Amino acid sequence: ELKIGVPLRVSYKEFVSQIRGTENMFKGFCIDVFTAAVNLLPYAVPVKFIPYGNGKENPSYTHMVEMITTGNFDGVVGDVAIVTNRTKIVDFTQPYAASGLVVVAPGGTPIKGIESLRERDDPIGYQVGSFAESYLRNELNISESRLVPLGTPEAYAKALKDGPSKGGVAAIVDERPYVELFLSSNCAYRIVGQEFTKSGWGFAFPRDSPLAIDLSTAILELAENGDLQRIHDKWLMKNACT
Ligand code: NA
Ligand code: NA
Incomplete structure (x- = not known):
């Protein structure tokens, strides 16, 4: 059972949010993409979502990813930017979102x-x-x-x-x-x-995690079969200004 850190967002909860009255239950764009990707793997990946944050303000996403290096998390699933200071300490999937x-x-x-x-x-x-x-x-x-x-x-x-x-x-x-x-x-x-x-x-995993590789080819299947677009449109379709 992988302990997966999830950021405890107080805003833009369309991306990911803790379901109210629960510790370990989450919903949003990022959760749906993660779930759809894992389901495309040919092995089981049991997961416990672990909230990261004080619940008063958005947490430090860099400090969140750093909890993989100390072994507090087996992975981090959320709206996490793939930036150099994080890629040097953990392995990311290829991006599931631009x-x-x-x-x-x-x-x-x-x-x-x-x-x-x-x-x-x-x-x-x-x-x-x-x-x-x-x-x-x-x-x-x-x-x-x-x-x-x-x-x-x-x-x-x-x-x-x-x-x-x-x-x-x-x-x-x-x-x-x-x-x-x-x-x-x-x-x-x-x-x-x-x-x-x-x-x-x-999605973030320890250095040399084969999960980072495998989920990248899941993301390709999500892209091709149109599920990435479908899951985007479920959460993030909004009324434009122009
Ligand atoms: Na799009
Ligand atoms: Na909705």
Whole structure:
């Protein structure tokens, strides 16, 4: 029986959430893809889902994956970006979902994309517990003092409305999937510029886990037979702004 860490999300629960009144029961896009993939394997994979987080805010996804290395988890299943600092310590499947950082801002500001954001000294929103915090500091050398953690689409919307003057932000940097959910309920804001990273979401296992290999060929079967699209459309189909 594999102990599988699952992030205890407080927001964008379409991706994955703990079913209310349970410890070990989860639902969402990521759970459905995991389940569909495992069922395509020719051996049984018994699983216990173990919640990772205090349940008050989204957990550190990097610290979550780090629990595989200490042996606390046999695997992590969730909306987990396949980024270098994680791939060096655990083995991911190939991505089951496309992701990548975008800039979200109000229309017709000085923010035209990630480069404009770097040239300026405005405060930047990112999602609590995201790798995005680390990409901004280390890869793009953005100052720690500019970075504002936001937990939910309500907080996103408040931060963008208040703006830099009133303790909010000029823009938020976050993965496209959360930004698409955010905008479908908050059409006053837009993506400006393009995706400037392209790391997908994958299932995480210990270094040399054959599960990482096998599930990648399950993901190909899910892609071809159209179940990936079907499971996307079940959870994430939303009313667009344009
Ligand atoms: Na799609
Ligand atoms: Na549903």
